[PDB]
Design a binder for this molecule. Structure first.
Ligand SMILES: O=C(O)CN(CC(=O)O)CC(=O)O
Ligand SMILES: [Fe+3]
Length: 157
């Protein structure tokens, strides 16, 4: 079991309703915590306007919402690769430097995204001496500490 969480830095003050126009770090296209849960959550609050697939791409809809992102595996929207770290031709592949739970978290740490969609063990696993520099974005419009995932997660997977 795990809990999908949205990690942000303590220096910022935006909440979930204020995500439009921010930059985002994702584990990869089509993965659970990094894409299916957050994007679906945003589509259902009505923040990302997608009503259905007509030629319709979710990628297009997301690229319109975030100003830029890193979404390893993205196929059609270059904006979704803009924040990725790496070489000109592989930075956006599904096994790129910012891919995976560790890579999405590094993208936030490096300041290449304002939010990283990862799981509840991610900050602890990758920056245990820096946990206090991060917090989580809750569905109810607040922020809570990294260890408070049980009451501040977007879904239990
Ligand atoms: O995200 C996925 O699509 C698949 N997962 C499990 C999961 O997150 O539930 C394995 C992994 O990404 O390593
Ligand atoms: Fe996963």
């Amino acid at each position: 079991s795990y809990y999908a969480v949205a990690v942000v830095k303590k220096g910022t003050d935006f909440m979930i309703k204020d995500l439009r126009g921010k930059t985002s770090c994702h584990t990869g296209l089509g993965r659970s915590a990094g894409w299916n849960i957050p994007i679906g959550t945003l589509i259902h609050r009505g923040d990302i306007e997608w009503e259905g697939i007509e030629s319709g791409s979710v990628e297009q809809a997301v690229a319109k919402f975030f100003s830029a992102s890193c979404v390893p595996g993205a196929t059609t929207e270059q904006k979704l690769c803009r924040q990725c770290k790496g070489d000109a031709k592989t930075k956006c592949l599904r096994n790129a430097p910012y891919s995976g739970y560790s890579g999405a978290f590094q993208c936030l740490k490096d300041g290449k995204g304002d939010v990283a969609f990862v799981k509840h063990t991610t900050v602890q696993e990758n920056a245990p001496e820096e946990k206090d520099e991060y917090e989580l974005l809750c569905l109810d419009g607040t922020r809570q500490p990294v260890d408070s995932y049980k009451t501040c997660n977007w879904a239990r997977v």
